[PDB]
Design a protein around this ligand. Structure first.
Ligand SMILES: [Zn+2]
Ligand SMILES: [Zn+2]
Ligand SMILES: [Zn+2]
Ligand SMILES: [Zn+2]
Ligand SMILES: [Zn+2]
Ligand SMILES: [Zn+2]
Ligand SMILES: [Zn+2]
Ligand SMILES: [Zn+2]
Lengths: 274, 274, 274, 274
């Protein structure tokens, strides 16, 4: 065999965590990533699996996720180190036959566990599966610097914040026509913040945690990463524009409207004011 | 043989896309690149060509481009991934004997197609060929962060924007004496925005799409890339200067004039106000 | 044997210095790093040791550090070059049997010596050992750009500066609940500045040298590095926020309080004003 | 033999140009570098030398430089590409027996020539040799972004600009106690701008070309590079500070004075106002 570390999904996680670390998004253990897998993905690797897979209960039943494997970043683990030791810093987990817990099948060496934002991840997986008829496979959280910065400065109103990000790069509307949901600041790594994130994931493929980070959902690691990067690129242009005293001109409502029409996209109504 | 992936032009595209990705210019699939090739370039590689080359019609006849091969980035494809799988993310295309379409000869695996900005590219190739007696070979579009930022802030007037970029780095005038044309915001990935870009490519080797990006034209990938990088470096100094409250001193008209005279360059008149 | 250069600690120092160089933190010889080792670490390597180990006296007796080996960056040496020649740029030192000096056992080729901030390092090691019952092993100093910038702008008051950094990224409080101590500007590379740093290391795992850099203490190179990076990431968001005219909203006192309670952390009282 | 490309000086030039390219300092062909060599350096490589060495006259006699070899960047050549093809992008030159010209002994393939700032380089070499009793070996010019930005904003007065850079990082004074000279803007790539640069090189190891770049002089490539990086790091902190509305506190005159006394350095008097 090839080792599981050489598999597309372990390699994908290395690539996405490293690229996010490279962006400045993932200081310390900041940020986390989980990718839903199929059985067919992990089964060719059954023989490189854990001494005996450890079971951890879920914070709450998740019957939709019954029998679902994921690969996931570990709690306390640094994005930077994933390329260096993926088996220490990643784990392959598989939720049990009625969504009450999971076995850690591979990785997370030395009694590591899945990310402390696992409630946010798994609950958002659940909603993204229903909301996209199962197409989304990734939930990604990173501390995207400019977006975080903007949360101290822009009205934390889903529609104004969406609209600013649409303006700040032409493509943004096309990439995220549903906009970006904003939560109130919440204590992170809780069931409550994961429920609230999962609820906005019903409506947006991006959700901001003010003064903390962003959560995105996508069909693949690249597309999820690129969703975020697009939101963050815009934030970065906006940071510069605001720091230079603000917009003198920008993309108008009609232009954003002609744009979503050409791209066959339905833009968040409430963000279409002026 | 060596594989085509080892050829100077596939390697050049890997180098230029990767370097642009590295700059922060090419979030997601943002940005695109096409390079005009000669027959002599691709012919030594005829035997590594496509199962059967797929034909796609052009949006409009382009008789100047009859029988011309290009290597081009694919629609939806990420600059970041080109180094990883050039054949998935690039394609070698060759316009047919009367400029009505092209066959995809190599790459663009899995039914990918050339960039959705192909009208902008090919039309601008057409004008750059006439305008430079065939010396330019590259059209490059990227989301150059500081230049985009400046479009929210500087008067979107070709001559004032040119002049600011000349000021923001001494060399700029020498590198782009013809200045940078500015389009009105337009819906991208359209025939109309490609015509309008191609029209300004008559007069400038750089063209700004406000709130979106820049288009440059050059004789080689490095020179085209470096054209852009020079415009963007200046924008970057200007962003900092404006963010610090503005210029207290700058390069004067006479100095810009003595400069274009020493370098044997004829600077855009309308940008020579004060 | 494997060479000592292949050992976890020489490799760790290469990794941490290089990563800091990569961050922009360590222009020229700026910044320095020392890591406390056990005998068991260096002993398997006794046979690759120095021609004859050179003795340098300590600036003052340090009996707690009797018989303790460290690996340390060299005076005048660049973080950038460590990956290139670790034995030229690092040294393994071992304090003597009553804390009056050390022998340079390995590295520091060509009569190099340990960092000129060695008083700061060793004295802070001494206090961090007592303050953490011997868990901290690292002292790291770098010129962390945004934190330095903030020292010209924020009230240099431990509690206001701590509080701003807590606000500037949610996790900060959890990572450094003890806050960051601020020294008056002091002449660096002196016994006085090392005593003063060591004294604040009694109370904080981070200490700012205004208009110069930060000192952090940690159990491991990654954790020490990540402590710093977290403080600096926040500073970086704050720089952007202030540059955009300041905070419109931020994390409130109660939220910071609910946060330190969920994470089982006791946040610096004096920073809990409003 | 080993090839000359593997020699310490070709490797040093690759390392310094690449690192500067990496910093953002050397867009396009911007920036240039020349390193004075000894005969003993190049002689072990005599047998890998040019088809027949081409002679180019000097713009003016330089008898001090008679029989002196240098390795130098080529005109129009990109710092980025040096690591890729050093022999295309670098050249080894040797001034003739009475300082009237040089033979290109190696590199600069395809009729490339030494940098168009060669008057600045060679004249500054001449002054740095006299001013340091022959210790300096490097002249380095790059478009250091923040320093360039500051030239639009700070009074272009040697003593105020020096003083700001001293403030903006503690170490700066120690690294460049002689300060940084400022020229009036001049047309670059001229004898006049090289004379004027060479004249300030009498007094400073750093010289600013406003709205263009910086020139530094050093004993080695690392030390010259690090001189610049230190000046630029400070500029970068200052850019942030000014962009946040300015300094509330900074390093005082007495502190800068105690600093230059501890480090055995004699700080530029005129920069010691307040
Ligand atoms: Zn987080
Ligand atoms: Zn975590
Ligand atoms: Zn675009
Ligand atoms: Zn595209
Ligand atoms: Zn320091
Ligand atoms: Zn040092
Ligand atoms: Zn220059
Ligand atoms: Zn040049």
């Amino acid at each position: 065999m090839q080792n599981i570390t050489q598999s597309w999904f372990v390699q994908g996680m290395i690539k996405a965590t490293t690229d996010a670390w490279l962006k400045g998004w993932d200081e310390r253990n900041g940020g986390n990533l989980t990718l839903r897998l199929d059985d067919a993905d992990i089964a060719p690797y059954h023989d490189n699996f854990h001494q005996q897979p450890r079971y951890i209960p879920l914070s709450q039943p998740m019957p939709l996720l019954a029998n679902t494997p994921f690969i996931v970043t570990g709690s306390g683990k640094f994005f930077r180190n994933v390329q260096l030791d993926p088996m220490a810093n990643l784990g392959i987990v598989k939720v049990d036959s009625d969504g009450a817990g999971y076995h850690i099948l591979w990785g997370l060496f030395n009694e590591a566990v899945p990310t402390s934002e696992l409630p946010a991840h798994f609950l958002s997986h659940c909603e993204r599966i229903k909301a996209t008829n199962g197409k989304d496979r990734v939930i990604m959280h990173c501390h995207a610097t400019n977006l975080i910065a903007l949360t101290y400065v822009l009205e934390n109103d889903t529609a104004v914040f969406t609209r600013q990000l649409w303006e700040g790069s032409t493509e943004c509307l096309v990439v995220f026509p549903d906009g970006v949901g904003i939560l109130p600041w919440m204590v992170p790594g809780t069931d409550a913040i994961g429920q609230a994130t999962a609820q906005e994931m019903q409506k947006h493929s991006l959700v901001l945690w003010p003064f903390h980070g962003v959560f995105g959902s996508g069909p693949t690691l690249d597309e999820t990463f690129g969703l975020i990067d697009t939101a963050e690129k815009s934030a970065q242009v906006l940071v510069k524009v605001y720091s230079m005293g603000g917009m003198k001109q920008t993309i108008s409502r009609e232009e954003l409207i002609a744009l979503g029409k050409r791209f066959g996209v339905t833009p968040l109504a409430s963000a279409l004011a002026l």
